[PDB]
Design a protein around this ligand. Structure first.
Ligand SMILES: CCCCCCCCCCCCCCCCCC(=O)OC[C@H](COP(=O)([O-])OCC(O)COP(=O)([O-])OC[C@@H](COC(=O)CCCCCCCCCCCCCCCCC)OC(=O)CCCCCCCCCCCCCCCCC)OC(=O)CCCCCCCCCCCCCCCCC
Ligand SMILES: CCCCCCCCCCCCCCCCCC(=O)OC[C@H](COP(=O)([O-])OCC(O)COP(=O)([O-])OC[C@@H](COC(=O)CCCCCCCCCCCCCCCCC)OC(=O)CCCCCCCCCCCCCCCCC)OC(=O)CCCCCCCCCCCCCCCCC
Ligand SMILES: CCCCCCCCCCCCCCCCC[C@@H](O)O[C@H](CO[C@H](O)CCCCCCCCCCCCCCC)COP(=O)(O)OCC[N+](C)(C)C
Ligand SMILES: CCCCCCCC/C=C/CCCCCCCC(=O)OC[C@H](COP(=O)(O)OCCN)OC(=O)CCCCCCC/C=C/CCCCCCCC
Ligand SMILES: CCCCCCCCCCCC(=O)SCCNC(=O)CCNC(=O)[C@H](O)C(C)(C)COP(=O)(O)O
Lengths: 124, 67, 98, 178, 110, 88, 55, 459, 52, 128, 55, 80
């Protein structure tokens, strides 16, 4: 989707732009934000040679899954818990991305409406 | 295996081919049912899809239309 | 409609000659007068080529640098190196989001 | 393929060919047998409705209209028999056909095998050699002074004559040579 | 796709060699019972081609469709991919229906 | 292997069989030398239908110029024998 | 009658395809490319007396 | 290098003193021996050439040409003895003498140290070829072909001679070593422009360049089989060798005088490849193929890069072998049916299967199938042209397509389909013809195995 | 040559020619391994319009 | 009634759709008979030599020789310099040359001008 | 797609005959791509190669 | 080998769709004189055929039974 129809048929001024995003400071609405942390060091991720696109914030679960797969080679059905954990961490990452998109949309629409209201008040 | 023409009648069928066909159809259906029982998440999805409309502004940190 | 008697007669004669020729095309019993161990397959088709290739790679291709290049093995935390004996430390005390 | 063509086709021949083509393309359109039988009976009724028209001008006009209708309503992908000129096996075995005169160039060692076959081949060659001149003389007598007017050939008439120009027709390689 | 495409072509070739080198589906009739093993193999192959769950073609085609659905991509390409994956089931249905169901239509010399 | 070696007797049997299934022809009145035009009282379209039935029976197409001339079952049997190189 | 040639032809195509797939440089990949192209040309026109096969 | 020259001048009296029924055997055996002796010249240095004496020298560019010439002479002898059976003994000896003289002239031509001696031998090669074409050719057109062969050459080569002597009046020498070491740039004047044209046009005609090629189809169709073999295989390469030698004194003028010749070469490559698609004569197809390949070599020599020179050498050798083989293949069918029309004898694979295999291999090599040296030369020239200008890959690409088409067309027209019914005099292939095709084809793949022997001095 | 009758006993069955008849100037263009001019179920410049 | 089919150069008119065949006259029949007679005479002449036991070789076809000679050796004698011939020759033999010359000259001038300014990214461009 | 194809194939059992639409013609003859691109470019190329390049 | 044709008097259009076709042609005054020739395609062992959904579920019963038995065993195998 509905967001596509909202942007491409409705008002695109209040709709987020996926290419240019976020347009607000990360600490704008929040008083203090915790810096997102990492569990895998660059060196370990290099020796693991994951990929350049698999080196996201959920790399540690992938590293453990790969280690178990190598250890449990002949039994290719024993690597289920860690695969589930990696899937869960990726799902959390996607949920955070959805939260960022919703934050940007709400901030954009609220800011534009508030500026329009301020201009209308000053024009009266 | 010698089978002669029939001329407007049903062809002669040996038991082996029907046995093989039925066994392989049955094993395909068994595999499908077993895998659906044990790997349902691959068809119905694993994790719930959240609705962004039900997220409060406290966690999204948007100012209450004042500042 | 139909054939003419000349056409019918010619077809009959040609058909007779053609059937005679086709009959002559048949073979008498003596016509082809010809004038005057188990697992050896796996030895002469698998073992010998692999021996030759192993020789050629081990002692001729390897003799020159950068001819056989393998990508380095993956290293995971908790591993021990075969040569140096060095062990790789664990991974930064997981948050354990159980 | 076997019969000599004529100078032109008659109106009855054109109507019969149109009937055959229409039935075949209707069968192509109607896949199932009962449906084909139903609409084939309908088409036969449509064809024999105007069977008794004495005016040839109107008959040719109806033939023209039927041809136009058939061209418009033809199947873009009609059914073709596998060995018909459009089929998937039309000229499949032409590469296995070898002329008989090739056997004349075989080595004597090759001809040492199959002795009886080559004895029969010698008999056939002698028959052809003896009959050639009589075939030539028969062709000359039968033909009109102003050259032949059709591709038809006369048959044998005399005691032990053979139909002129028979060798290459009788000694065809085969339909499935190899 | 190598697996089930090659096996589908072998099943078609078995049918063609059975009915005297005939390839048109308009002249192939009821082969469900005349050719049981060929029927079973072709049914399985058509199911795998159409992305039936937990078969061979499922593990690649299903992931491909889900990957094109969640990408910053051309919308026309996505629509054409969806219409094509419908037409895949369409033509598999056509093959099965015309070749293996109904009454015989091949020449009577069986 | 492949198809059995079609023989003249089989061809005649099949031709007579397909002819005896036609409703416009009496089975008993039919002989191998029966004429379609004179003996049987059929028209040209009936001959065309019989020719198409022959083609469907034997799975190959008879050209029209060769098809019009065939008038009796013996002619059909001979034509199919010559087209298929049957000598026995 | 020429089934041996056919099997030989099938094997040559397989060899050329392995050459294509395992190539590490562009010249060897081109060798495999043109090899499978030529083998496809030869096998499509298996019945060389038929005009449509050559076309 | 008199160890190669003198044995040919000894072939002369040996042929003229042999028995009436041993001329072919003796000539073939001793020409094969001379080729084996000449094989030793491939041992070339990396810095300079083999300077045997004040008059003869051998480089890495001319050594493969000598080896190809010495290898081609026995092939010409084997191809000629079929249609020369009814000739008298004296005329057969004269034919063998003409071939021997042509080989001797070419051998000295490819190794001359001075430009004037090279010109003299390069012009002396005309007489045996003209005599062969105009005397032992089959049809009445041969005479006209001979004229077209002769004057087309001379009208381009006579000015060069003047230029040559003028150079010796200015630089003081015409030896290739002194010329290379004492080279100076050519200024921008009309005099220097016309000197460039005088030095270039002779070799341009000999290639031949498009628009100057009208003599080639006549000469290569009307000449006997050995004449066609020697014209396509070696005589076209004289122009390329000479242009490579002479371009050392023409810089930097070439940098802008190569434009019209480059455009003519590329567009005529396309045009002749297109002509080959609609040809009713089988020999003319091979002749126009030769024109296209030589146009490629002209482009390579004109752009003047090491890669283009290497590709030009490889393509010269490969095309010589390929065109000789194709001419022999066409000549076998002509000897069988006595007519050159392509659609006359069809479906020959059914009657001559091994000859069908030879046709297939020759056609595959013609369309540059990897990894043959044909493709090596073509691809090197293509890369050099792409470096010269990125747009060239369009035209070359078109040619790379069209060539293949007509190649396969020829094959499918002659070997596939159904045999002509009324042609019944097609006898099984002799051992002589099969040996001829095998001796044409095996060296091609052998050189494919070791491609550095034909890549020239720039390797 | 594709348009010629395929059921006639041509002297050259592959080329669909007879001995002695005049040969088209562009025969090698029309050898039926090549450009075909046979009629189509849908007329030209209607297939062109649909495809474009 | 039904939509009309209009033939083209590469999709000709069907024989059964030709108006000129449905309106026949006796002179048309005479012409058809003459054509059939000519064809039958040629066929008989060919077949006499085709079936001859003593014939060994190739039956010469004057039609093939005429076709090849017309396509090859009869072209120049029947050539006249006309405005159409001259215009087509000049166009098809000169225009492509100058077009390609302009294209390549412009491309090379742009490349050289970029080279002089020192901005062509010739890094690792060792082989030429 | 399964359901729609099955319905359209079951329709063929009815005793009805209708002339095809233009969409069916487009689909059956491969968008007319072989009918146009295998006749126009080949004809123009061969005609130009004989008339202009050769003659 | 050495097989003879079956008799021609057993092929009948009664009880087949050919009867329906003859019925509709009768109301129009027409006739179908070729029905017995196509009667063989409906007469013998080709009398009945499965549906598309029936074809898709060819061996569903045996496979389902085996799956049910396997699930029952697995449910009573974890009790170790
Ligand atoms: C990888 C292969 C390994 C092979 C190991 C052994 C190699 C020996 C090579 C010896 C030279 C080849 C023979 C030349 C003369 C032909 C012989 C003959 O008369 O046969 C009749 C004889 C008797 O048969 P018959 O019953 O009389 O048949 C009647 C008809 O003639 C009917 O006969 P037919 O229809 O069977 O026709 C014969 C057949 C075969 O005949 C030929 O065509 C021979 C020539 C092939 C085409 C060559 C032109 C194109 C350029 C190729 C350049 C390759 C050079 C390699 C170095 C060669 C050095 C000697 O035709 C074809 O199959 C078409 C060939 C298409 C080839 C496609 C692949 C192209 C090249 C691919 C890459 C090559 C490099 C691989 C390595 C790359 C890195 C991994 O049969 C044979 O001799 C055996 C045939 C074997 C076919 C092999 C074809 C592939 C060879 C490619 C080159 C091999 C290189 C070897 C070195 C290692 C690499
Ligand atoms: C729920 C959310 C999702 C929403 C999705 C959409 C919602 C709607 C759902 C369903 C919608 C479609 C329902 C079925 C489709 C119709 C099927 C059909 O056959 O109808 C019969 C009818 C023809 O049947 P017939 O000729 O009488 O049959 C002959 C015999 O039956 C011969 O018998 P036969 O044995 O040879 O068999 C014939 C054969 C085939 O018979 C045919 O030849 C007809 C071909 C029809 C199939 C085409 C469907 C795909 C369309 C793709 C088009 C791409 C754009 C093309 C651009 C062209 C530009 C000019 O029949 C079949 O095998 C089955 C056909 C297809 C059934 C399966 C359909 C599934 C795919 C379509 C639905 C997609 C669902 C999932 C998509 C979800 C995406 C979010 O079709 C039509 O007449 C309409 C076709 C639509 C063409 C649209 C193009 C526009 C036309 C006018 C243009 C005006 C131009 C203005 C000027 C411009 C200036 C430049
Ligand atoms: C069938 C094919 C046959 C083979 C064709 C061989 C090709 C030969 C063509 C020769 C290449 C170019 C010749 C001269 C080089 C430049 C040509 C000219 O266009 O350039 C301008 C020349 O300007 C004008 O063109 C003046 C020349 C005009 C007279 C030439 C005749 C052109 C008409 C075409 C006749 C066709 C010739 C071939 C006949 C068969 C440059 O101006 P400018 O900087 O001042 O001169 C440079 C020399 N400087 C430095 C000493 C001063
Ligand atoms: C890059 C430069 C060249 C690009 C190509 C431009 C067009 C090339 C035209 C080639 C002309 C060659 C003429 C002689 C060829 C030999 C004769 C021939 O092939 O006969 C035609 C033969 C017979 O037709 P059938 O349908 O098979 O009938 C058989 C049943 N009766 O069929 C063919 O081969 C025709 C092939 C010609 C195709 C030309 C059109 C192709 C255009 C492609 C351009 C699209 C580019 C794609 C871009 C992809 C995105 C990066
Ligand atoms: C599937 C899409 C294609 C279907 C479209 C085609 C439909 C066309 C239907 C209309 C065709 C006609 O009625 S056209 C009817 C033409 N009218 C006449 O011919 C009247 C003169 N009678 C005769 O010529 C003979 O009696 C003859 C009738 C030949 C019988 O021949 P025989 O008795 O000696 O065998």
């Amino acid at each position: 989707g509905a967001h596509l129809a909202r942007r491409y048929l409705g008002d695109a001024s209040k709709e987020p732009d996926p290419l240019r995003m976020p347009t607000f400071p990360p600490d704008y609405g929040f008083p203090e934000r915790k810096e997102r942390e990492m569990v895998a060091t660059q060196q370990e991720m290099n020796d693991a040679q994951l990929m350049l696109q698999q080196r996201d914030y959920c790399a540690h679960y992938l590293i453990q899954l790969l280690k178990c797969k190598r250890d449990s080679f002949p039994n290719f059905l024993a690597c289920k818990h860690e695969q589930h954990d990696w899937d869960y961490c990726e799902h959390l990452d996607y949920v955070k991305r959805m939260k960022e998109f919703e934050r940007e949309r709400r901030l954009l629409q609220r800011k534009k409406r508030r500026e329009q209201r301020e201009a209308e008040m000053a024009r009266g | 295996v010698h089978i002669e023409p029939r001329y407007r009648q049903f062809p002669q069928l040996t038991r082996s081919q029907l046995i093989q066909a039925e066994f392989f159809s049955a094993t395909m259906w068994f595999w499908i049912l077993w895998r659906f029982w044990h790997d349902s998440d691959a068809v119905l999805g694993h994790f719930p899809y959240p609705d962004p409309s039900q997220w409060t502004d406290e966690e999204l940190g948007i100012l209450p239309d004042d500042e | 409609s139909g054939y003419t008697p000349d056409e019918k007669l010619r077809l009959q004669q040609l058909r007779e000659l053609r059937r005679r020729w086709l009959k002559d095309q048949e073979l008498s019993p003596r016509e082809p007068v010809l004038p005057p161990r188990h697992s050896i397959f796996a030895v002469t088709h698998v073992l010998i080529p692999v021996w030759i290739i192993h020789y050629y790679l081990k002692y001729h291709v390897t003799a020159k640098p950068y001819t056989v290049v393998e990508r380095k093995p993956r290293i995971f935390p908790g591993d021990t190196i075969l040569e140096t004996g060095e062990v790789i430390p664990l991974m930064k005390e997981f948050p354990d989001q159980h | 393929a076997f019969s000599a063509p004529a100078a032109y086709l008659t109106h009855q021949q054109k109507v019969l060919r149109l009937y055959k083509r229409a039935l075949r393309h209707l069968e192509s359109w109607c896949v199932h047998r009962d449906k084909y039988r139903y609409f084939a009976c309908l088409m036969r009724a449509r064809f024999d409705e105007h069977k008794n028209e004495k005016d040839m001008v109107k008959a040719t006009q109806l033939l023209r209209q039927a041809e136009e209708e058939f061209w418009y309503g033809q199947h873009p992908q009609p059914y073709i028999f596998p060995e018909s000129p459009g089929g998937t096996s039309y000229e499949r075995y032409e590469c296995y056909k070898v002329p008989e005169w090739c056997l004349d160039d075989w080595h004597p060692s090759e001809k040492a095998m199959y002795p009886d076959y080559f004895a029969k081949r010698e008999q056939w060659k002698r028959l052809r050699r003896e009959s050639w001149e009589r075939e030539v003389k028969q062709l000359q007598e039968e033909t009109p002074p102003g050259g032949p007017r059709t591709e038809a050939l006369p048959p044998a008439r005399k005691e032990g004559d053979l139909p002129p120009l028979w060798w290459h027709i009788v000694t065809r390689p085969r339909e499935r040579p190899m | 796709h190598a697996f089930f495409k090659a096996m589908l072509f072998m099943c078609s070739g078995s049918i063609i060699h059975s009915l005297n080198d005939e390839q048109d589906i308009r002249k192939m009739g009821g082969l469900y019972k005349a050719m049981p093993f060929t029927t079973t193999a072709l049914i399985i192959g058509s199911l795998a081609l159409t992305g039936m769950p937990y078969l061979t073609g499922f593990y690649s085609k299903d992931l491909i469709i889900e990957a094109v659905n969640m990408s910053y991509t051309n919308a026309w390409a996505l629509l054409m991919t969806l219409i094509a994956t419908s037409l895949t089931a369409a033509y598999s249905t056509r093959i099965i229906f015309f070749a293996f169901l109904g009454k015989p239509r091949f020449p009577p010399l069986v | 292997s492949d198809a059995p070696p079609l023989t003249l007797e089989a061809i005649k049997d099949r031709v007579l069989y397909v002819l005896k299934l036609y409703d416009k022809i009496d089975p008993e009145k039919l002989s191998v030398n029966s004429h379609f035009m004179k003996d049987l009282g059929l028209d040209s379209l009936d001959q065309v239908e019989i020719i198409m039935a022959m083609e469907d029976e034997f799975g190959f197409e008879i050209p029209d110029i060769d098809a019009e001339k065939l008038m009796c079952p013996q002619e059909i049997v001979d034509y199919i024998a010559d087209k298929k190189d049957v000598y026995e | 009658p020429f089934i041996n040639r056919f099997f030989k032809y099938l094997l040559l195509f397989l060899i050329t395809m392995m050459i294509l797939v395992t190539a590490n440089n562009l010249f060897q990949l081109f060798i495999g490319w043109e090899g499978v192209g030529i083998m496809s040309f030869l096998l499509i026109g298996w019945w060389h007396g038929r005009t449509d096969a050559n076309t | 290098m008199l160890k190669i020259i003198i044995p040919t001048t000894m072939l002369l009296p040996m042929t003229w003193m042999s028995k009436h029924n041993m001329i072919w055997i003796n000539a073939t055996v001793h020409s094969l021996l001379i080729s084996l002796i000449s094989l030793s010249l491939l041992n070339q240095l990396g810095e300079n050439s083999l300077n045997f004496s004040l008059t003869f020298f051998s480089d890495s560019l001319s050594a493969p040409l000598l080896v190809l010439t010495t290898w081609l002479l026995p092939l010409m002898l084997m191809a000629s003895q079929s249609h020369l059976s009814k000739e008298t003994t004296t005329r057969k000896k004269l034919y063998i003498t003409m071939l021997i003289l042509l080989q001797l002239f070419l051998i000295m031509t490819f190794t001359a140290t001075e430009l004037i001696l090279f010109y003299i031998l390069f012009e002396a090669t005309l007489v045996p070829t003209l005599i062969i074409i105009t005397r032992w050719g089959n049809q009445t057109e041969r005479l006209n072909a001979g004229l077209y062969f002769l004057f087309y050459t001379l009208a381009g080569s006579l000015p060069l001679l003047v230029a040559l002597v003028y150079i010796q009046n200015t630089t003081g020498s015409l030896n290739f070593l002194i010329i290379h070491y004492w080279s100076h740039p050519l200024s921008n004047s009309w005099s220097n422009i016309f000197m460039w044209l005088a030095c270039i046009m002779a070799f341009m005609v000999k290639m031949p360049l498009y628009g100057l090629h009208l003599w080639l189809p006549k000469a290569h169709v009307e000449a006997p089989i050995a004449g066609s073999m020697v014209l396509a295989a070696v005589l076209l390469k004289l122009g390329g060798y000479g242009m490579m030698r002479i371009t050392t004194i023409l810089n930097p003028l070439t940098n802008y005088m190569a434009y019209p010749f480059l455009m003519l070469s590329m567009w005529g490559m396309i045009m002749t490849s297109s002509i080959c698609l609609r040809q009713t004569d089988l020999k003319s197809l091979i002749a126009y193929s030769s024109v296209s390949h030589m146009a490629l070599v002209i482009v390579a020599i004109m752009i003047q890069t090491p890669w283009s020179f290497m590709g030009a050498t490889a393509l010269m050798i490969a095309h010589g072998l390929t065109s000789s083989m194709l001419f022999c293949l066409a000549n076998t069918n002509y000897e069988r049916v006595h007519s050159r029309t392509m659609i006359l004898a069809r479906g020959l694979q059914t009657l001559l299967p091994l000859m069908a295999t030879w046709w297939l291999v020759a056609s595959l090599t013609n369309l540059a199938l990897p990894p043959s040296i044909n493709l090596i030369g073509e691809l090197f020239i293509i890369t050099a042209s792409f470096s010269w200008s990125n747009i060239t890959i369009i035209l070359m690409g078109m040619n790379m397509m069209i060539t293949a088409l007509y190649s396969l067309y020829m094959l499918i027209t002659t070997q596939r389909g159904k045999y002509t019914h009324h042609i019944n005099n097609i006898k099984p292939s002799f051992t002589r013809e099969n040996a001829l095709m095998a001796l044409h084809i095996l060296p091609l793949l052998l050189l494919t195995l070791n491609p550095k022997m034909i890549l020239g001095p720039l390797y | 040559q594709q348009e010629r009758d395929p059921w006639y006993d041509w002297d050259h069955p592959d080329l669909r020619l007879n001995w002695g008849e005049p040969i088209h100037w562009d025969l090698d263009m029309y050898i039926r391994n090549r450009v075909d001019t046979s009629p189509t179920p849908v007329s030209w410049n209607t297939m062109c319009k649909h495809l474009f | 009634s039904f939509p009309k089919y209009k033939p083209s150069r590469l999709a000709t008119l069907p024989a059964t759709l030709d108006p000129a065949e449905y309106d026949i006259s006796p002179e048309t029949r005479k012409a058809q008979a003459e054509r059939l007679a000519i064809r039958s005479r040629l066929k008989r002449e060919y077949l006499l030599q085709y079936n001859d036991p003593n014939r060994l070789g190739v039956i010469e076809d004057p039609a093939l020789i005429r076709w090849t000679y017309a396509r090859s050796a009869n072209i120049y004698p029947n050539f006249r310099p006309t405005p159409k011939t001259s215009l087509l020759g000049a166009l098809f033999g000169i225009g492509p040359l100058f077009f390609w010359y302009y294209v390549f000259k412009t491309d090379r001038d742009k490349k050289e001008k970029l080279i002089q300014e020192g901005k062509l990214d010739q890094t690792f461009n060792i082989s030429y | 797609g399964f359901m729609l194809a099955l319905e359209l194939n079951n329709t063929t059992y009815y005793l009805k005959f209708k002339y095809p639409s233009q969409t069916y013609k487009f689909s059956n003859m491969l968008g007319y791509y072989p009918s146009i691109m295998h006749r126009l470019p080949t004809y123009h190329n061969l005609s130009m190669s004989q008339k202009s390049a050769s003659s | 080998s050495k097989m003879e044709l079956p008799d021609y008097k057993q092929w009948k259009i009664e009880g087949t769709p050919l009867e329906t076709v003859q019925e509709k042609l009768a109301a129009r005054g027409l006739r179908d004189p070729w029905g017995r020739n196509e009667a063989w395609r409906y007469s013998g062992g080709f009398a009945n055929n499965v549906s598309f959904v029936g074809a898709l579920l060819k061996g569903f019963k045996w496979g389902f039974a085996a799956f049910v038995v396997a699930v029952g065993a697995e449910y009573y195998l974890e009790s170790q």
